[PDB]
């Protein structure tokens, strides 16, 4: 649900 995915 947290849209702040790690772009790595």
């Amino acid at each position, epitope marked *: *649900a947290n849209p702040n*995915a790690n*772009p790595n």
Partner: antibody
Amino acid sequence: EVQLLESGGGLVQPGGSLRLSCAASGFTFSSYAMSWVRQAPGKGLEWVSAISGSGGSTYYADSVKGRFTISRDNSKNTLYLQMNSLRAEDTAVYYCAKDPGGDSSPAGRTWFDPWGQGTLVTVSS
Amino acid sequence: DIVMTQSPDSLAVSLGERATINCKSSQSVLYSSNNKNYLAWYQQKPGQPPKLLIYWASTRESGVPDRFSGSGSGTDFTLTISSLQAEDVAVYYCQQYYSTPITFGQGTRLEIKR
């Protein structure tokens, strides 16, 4: 409402130690990564340290690595920053700041809202 | 580390006019998987903590007046304040959260011309 309140700042001798605290209210504390961000007088913003919601992960800026330790008590809604071997250049207002969305990875890789009012740390003899 | 550079460092703008502040990242903060720009903007008034204005480069935080808007993509971003009000005197900061350590721009001091 979500609120953060820092305490513990004060005058410290160079080489000395201080512990900062940040009391959180108004949200499920352990669901959110928390960070410390500091601002030297008249200067900009420098991220210092972050901790995951569970406390299982901690990260530090190179400028404080080996001297500062971040921790949290998820039974007391409190975040801590233990500062050892303090230097003149550590003089700053220290802010507690919350991950607005949750427990982003790595802890501290986020924008911040809200921020506390800050606590002033002065390192001087 | 990603370096954030704001342009200009300071500017003076009269009430009711539009102020524009630019922010450049030293590498792109656009994630191709979700097409999001990992960029935020803050306002800091004297004696106060920074206050969030914009995140994901263009999403306005709840409660922020709609005269504040963010735009841009990749490495080049802009904060625009329309219809400037007297209380908008502040230092404005951009920040990337694409990679750690997170980093801030150096700040742009907005003066009100009168």
